[PDB]
Design a protein around this ligand. Sequence first.
Ligand SMILES: Nc1nc(NCCc2ccc(O)cc2)nc2nc(-c3ccco3)nn12
Length: 375
Amino acid sequence: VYITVELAIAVLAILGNVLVCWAVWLNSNLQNVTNYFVVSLAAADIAVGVLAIPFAITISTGFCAACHGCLFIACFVLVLTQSSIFSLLAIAIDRYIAIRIPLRYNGLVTGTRAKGIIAICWVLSFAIGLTPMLGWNNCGQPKEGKNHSQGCGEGQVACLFEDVVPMNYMVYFNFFACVLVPLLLMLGVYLRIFLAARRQLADLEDNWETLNDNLKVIEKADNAAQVKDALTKMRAAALDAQKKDFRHGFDILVGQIDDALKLANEGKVKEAQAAAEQLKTTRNAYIQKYLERARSTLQKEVHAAKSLAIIVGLFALCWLPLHIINCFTFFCPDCSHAPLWLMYLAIVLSHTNSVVNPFIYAYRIREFRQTFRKI
Ligand SMILES: Nc1nc(NCCc2ccc(O)cc2)nc2nc(-c3ccco3)nn12
């Protein structure tokens, strides 16, 4: 039962995520910093699928060996999880930068810096993974009955997770800080990302609404005064929207508005409306082209952000229950120990996470869809 599902999930991990690594290599279209991060995460998934499943299946029954080796068997999954969480945080930061500040996105994001951050986060993940090895372990604590049952020699120690790895260390430091604080920061980042996109779309629509309504009032107006009032709002909206296509269009538009305002200050309303009709051409052409490009660009950014948010949510909801039951067991010693059959089920769910990643990229991103069908 348990042995069957672990092997079944393991096989889907390699072949499922090797395509994601394969796709980034045989498709120049899908190659950027976000893909570099997600392929680092995919390499972490490859590593967990290849190694942790045999490690879990051999530690589930028992494999007596040196205490350091057994501790490594248990910390390898944790380091491959910390790598994934760091990669997800980097992805979230990349998306926030790209959407909030598109002008400086290319300036502040570079491939060399992305590779450097990937290396830094991987070695940092190794730091947490190897932290229990050095000094913080439970090797010194005797288990007489156990070591007699498995026939443990002096050098070799039996493998039993909860009694070989520091439970208090795990529950206190491993969960709280380096899981949650990344998760809370990531949630705040995603909320900020969506708020920024909504605000930007609202601002563009408001500027278009002003540049249309004021013009309509211009033809539907009279006795100057209102004309000079409306062109002031036109200038304000045009400058705000501007802050070769966009620049030249807005320069021509503000020049025409200045001409109309200068010609209407003298009191010549007929040619004031003539100049408004003159505006009506540049408005249509350049402003409509700019708006149609901007809306599609923002929609694409929002779609990418939603995809990555879904990946994050799946990661969190797959790695949450195990830690929750672990901290429940730690903080209620008087409570009866959690059932073995349920604990194994939760571990299966956690490892399942690696399988889920390629399915999202094969179902939502059309760029990966074509190349997977190619294979
Ligand atoms: N609680 C736990 N158990 C095991 N394996 C030991 C299975 C077991 C659990 C309870 C029992 O009474 C006898 C055996 N691996 C485990 N890995 C983790 C883990 C990975 C990341 C965070 O926690 N927790 N965890």
